[PDB]
Amino acid sequence: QEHKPKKDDFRNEFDHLLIEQANHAIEKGEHQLLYLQHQLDELNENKSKELQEKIIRELDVVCAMIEGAQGALERELKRTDLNILERFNYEEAQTLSKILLKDLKETEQKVKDIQTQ
């Protein structure tokens, strides 16, 4: 009926596999992106400077950690080869990650676009 989330937030990655990390990061990113993006909508109504600051600050810190791990992971996972499936999956991960990063800076564009006091 109702799917409870992950009870332990400070839980370390169990699988820790190249593609597993990628799908793990994007799952977290997706959830936080949609979260802050809905907050953008609220911010857009409040036009609150402090709210703007919190939103852009949390966006920034998550965007940075995501990009750092993504860049690292991409470089590493590239050591894998000879596998039509892995090729497809890698390319697919790159596809979704790029979309995710786009949406981050897109939301960034929105928060920076709202004039505050």
Side-chain angles (χ1 to χ4, degrees), residues 20-64:
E20 285 295 85
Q21 207 298 92
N23 74 78
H24 197 200
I26 59 178
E27 175 57 45
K28 172 175 285 296
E30 177 183 70
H31 185 246
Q32 61 81 211
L33 180 274
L34 63 84
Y35 183 89
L36 277 310
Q37 200 166 90
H38 276 269
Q39 290 305 148
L40 197 297
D41 188 272
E42 174 161 74
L43 174 66
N44 211 322
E45 185 64 69
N46 284 268
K47 298 288 182 172
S48 177
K49 52 267 190 156
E50 59 182 288
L51 184 62
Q52 183 192 32
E53 188 169 271
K54 298 293 184 178
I55 292 178
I56 189 177
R57 255 58 179 169
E58 297 289 81
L59 189 163
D60 174 89
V61 300
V62 178
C63 187

Side-chain angles (χ1 to χ4, degrees), residues 77-88:
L77 57 72
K78 277 311 188 308
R79 72 196 299 137
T80 314
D81 203 73
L82 227 299
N83 198 313
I84 301 177
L85 179 65
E86 297 187 286
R87 175 67 185 225
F88 173 72

Side-chain angles (χ1 to χ4, degrees), residues 18 70-82 87 90-91 94:
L18 298 172
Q70 205 198 272
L73 185 66
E74 292 183 278
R75 188 183 306 202
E76 286 299 279
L77 57 72
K78 277 311 188 308
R79 72 196 299 137
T80 314
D81 203 73
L82 227 299
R87 175 67 185 225
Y90 282 26
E91 286 193 67
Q94 178 179 270

